[PDB]
Every structure is written in structure tokens, then in C-alpha cells.
């Protein structure tokens, strides 16, 4: 057969969760082959197929600071991490079906919330009332597995194919962030009475939801000079959303005003505390091996901490 392989400091790093998946844009189709065919299997899918599906899932996502190709690669290095580290709890379509989600998860998106749709009336907005940009995202997931030559499960059956893509369909929906804080509440009581339970379906529908969710966040946690640059590009999109909110005659929300530039700090300790943690938290409860998501989590936590207390700078 022929085998994907990286060099040396990849083929070590890339197991860890904290990887960077590095500036080499020509280099990030390779790793996500080689995720596929160590999580899933050399025969999950024909190479030429997969192949044709990255580059086209590649095209169809934009030149945008933060929810570009590269977030959508990283987002499923994270999701591999979560597979290799739990590899006895998860069945083959899910190991097939939730790499393929990360990768298209954020496809098309123009660096806008569903919130801007809403108040701006994009077309999408009346398409889909909720969840606007993520039923989009899957929308274009389906369109791409539809053109000629990209059907990567060609080999399933009629029933499998529509639970692969009901997996592809739900894991995108999860990354609306909305829908995140009922999901954490509903596992975090679920955990607590011990009712949780991986046989039962809406329940694995849960789970996975908070793997997508900690998967599309996973930016915090990385190491800190990781963390902090890869801040600077989400704040340049919702910067610019919030001007397109100025120029609709809205007042963004703080985040998204660039000239709360220096609340950043004071608002990344905000996010920290009411959404990561509780997130990575909840997901070590309920799978243990992803306790380095949550450490590295605090380690930057405490970094933004030292930023406050100007121990540190964030240039
Ligand atoms: C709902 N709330 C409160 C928020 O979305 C929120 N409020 N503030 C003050 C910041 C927020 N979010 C982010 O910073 C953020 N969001 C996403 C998701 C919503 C798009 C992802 C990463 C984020 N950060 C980040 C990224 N890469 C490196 N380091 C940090
Ligand atoms: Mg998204
Ligand atoms: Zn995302």
C-alpha cells in the first residue's frame, strides 16, 4: 500500500493535543490524510476520492482571518487527538463521519455570526431561522460530496451513507456556540445523577456535540505564543463585524468594537471562565484522556491573568 508518512518532529508532535499544525499551507491535506488513515483506517476511504473532496472542501473556504482552511484542519487535528486517546469508544462510521465534519464545518463562512446575518437580512437568515451559518456549512458539505468523483462513502450502504451524514449533519449544527451552553447543562446533570449513558444515541448526539464544540475552541489550547497570535485573528473578524454593525446604525456588542481594543485581555479572562473552562471541564469528566485540552486551557487562563497584571504584553 501506499502509506502516508511525516517527518520526524510531526509524526512525534502531531499525537500531542497542544500541535500546531504549522504555516505550510501545502502541508495540511497530508496531515489530514495521515489523521484519516491512522484514526479510521487506510480502507475508510479511496485516496483519489478523499483527495478530490479536501481540494474542493480547500476552494470553498475563504480568505478570512480566523474561520479559514487552516482553522478547519486544526479543528480536526484536535478531533484525531480525541479518537486516538478514547479509541475504544467510538463505532467506524463516527470515526469516518466526525474527521470529515471538523474539516467542513466552517465551509463558505465570510468571518460574519449569525447575529450580523440576522440584522443585516442575508438571504440565509430567511433560509434558516436558526443556526443560520452552521445549516449553511453543512449545505455546502453536501453540495461537494454531490459533484462528480467526491463521494468518499461510495462504499457504504443507502442506510450507513444517511447515518454518516445524520453524524456529519449534527456534529456541524453542535458548533453554533448557542446551542453549547443548554448541551454542557443538559451532560453536566447528566454526569452529576449518572443517568449519562454512550449506548443511548441522543445521548452520544450530546457528546459529540461537546467534542465540536471543544474541537472549533481548541485555538485555547494551544501554547501560549500559539494561543495569543491566533487571538489577534478571530478579534480582526469580529472587529470588522462589529464596523458592518457600526454601519447599519447597531452598536456591536464589546468584543466586536476594535475600539475596545485594550478590554481584550479583560474579555478573553470573560470567555475563559463562563465558556472554556466550563467546556473542557465537562469534557474531561466525561472522557478522561482529554485532560490536556483543560490544563493547557488554565496554563493560558493564568497567562491572560499575567497580561491584566502587565507581568506579560500582548503586542
Ligand atoms: C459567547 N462569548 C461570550 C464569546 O464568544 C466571547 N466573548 N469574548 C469576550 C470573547 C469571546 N470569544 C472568543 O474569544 C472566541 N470565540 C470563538 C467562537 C465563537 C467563535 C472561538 C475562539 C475564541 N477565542 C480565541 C481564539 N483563538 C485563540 N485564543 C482565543
Ligand atoms: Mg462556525
Ligand atoms: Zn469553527
Not at 478547519?72 to 466526525?98: P, S, W
Request: with cysteine; aromatic share 10%.
Amino acid at each position: 500500500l501506499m502509506q502516508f508518512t511525516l517527518p520526524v518532529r510531526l509524526c512525534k508532535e502531531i499525537e500531542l493535543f497542544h500541535f500546531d499544525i504549522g504555516p505550510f499551507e501545502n502541508m495540511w491535506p497530508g496531515i489530514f490524510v495521515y489523521m484519516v488513515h491512522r484514526s479510521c483506517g487506510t480502507s475508510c476511504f479511496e485516496l483519489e476520492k478523499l483527495c478530490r473532496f479536501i481540494m474542493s472542501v480547500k476552494k470553498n473556504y475563504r480568505r478570512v482571518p480566523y474561520h479559514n482552511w487552516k482553522h478547519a484542519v486544526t479543528v480536526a487535528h484536535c478531533m484525531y487527538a480525541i479518537l486516538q486517546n478514547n479509541h475504544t469508544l467510538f463505532t467506524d462510521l463516527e470515526r469516518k463521519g466526525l474527521l470529515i465534519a471538523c474539516l467542513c464545518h466552517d465551509l463558505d463562512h465570510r468571518g460574519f455570526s449569525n447575529s450580523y446575518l440576522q440584522k443585516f437580512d442575508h438571504p440565509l437568515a430567511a433560509l434558516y431561522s436558526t443556526s443560520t451559518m452552521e445549516q449553511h456549512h453543512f449545505s455546502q458539505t453536501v453540495s461537494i460530496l454531490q459533484l462528480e468523483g467526491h463521494n468518499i462513502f461510495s462504499t457504504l450502504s443507502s442506510s450507513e451513507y444517511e447515518q454518516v451524514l445524520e453524524i456529519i449533519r449534527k456534529a456541524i449544527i453542535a458548533t453554533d456556540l448557542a446551542l453549547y451552553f443548554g448541551n454542557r447543562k443538559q451532560l453536566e446533570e447528566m454526569y452529576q445523577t449518572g443517568s449519562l449513558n454512550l449506548n443511548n444515541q441522543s445521548h452520544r448526539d450530546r457528546v459529540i456535540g461537546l467534542m465540536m464544540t471543544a474541537c472549533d475552541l481548541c485555538s485555547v489550547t494551544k501554547l501560549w505564543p500559539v494561543t495569543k497570535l491566533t487571538a489577534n485573528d478571530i478579534y480582526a473578524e469580529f472587529w470588522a463585524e462589529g464596523d458592518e454593525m457600526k454601519k447599519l446604525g447597531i452598536q456591536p456588542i464589546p468584543m466586536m468594537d476594535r475600539d475596545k481594543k485594550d478590554e481584550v485581555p479583560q474579555g478573553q479572562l470573560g470567555f475563559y471562565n463562563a465558556v472554556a473552562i466550563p467546556c473542557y471541564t465537562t469534557l474531561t469528566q466525561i472522557l478522561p484522556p482529554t485532560e490536556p485540552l483543560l490544563k493547557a486551557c488554565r496554563d493560558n487562563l493564568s497567562q491572560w491573568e499575567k497580561v491584566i497584571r502587565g507581568e506579560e504584553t500582548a503586542t
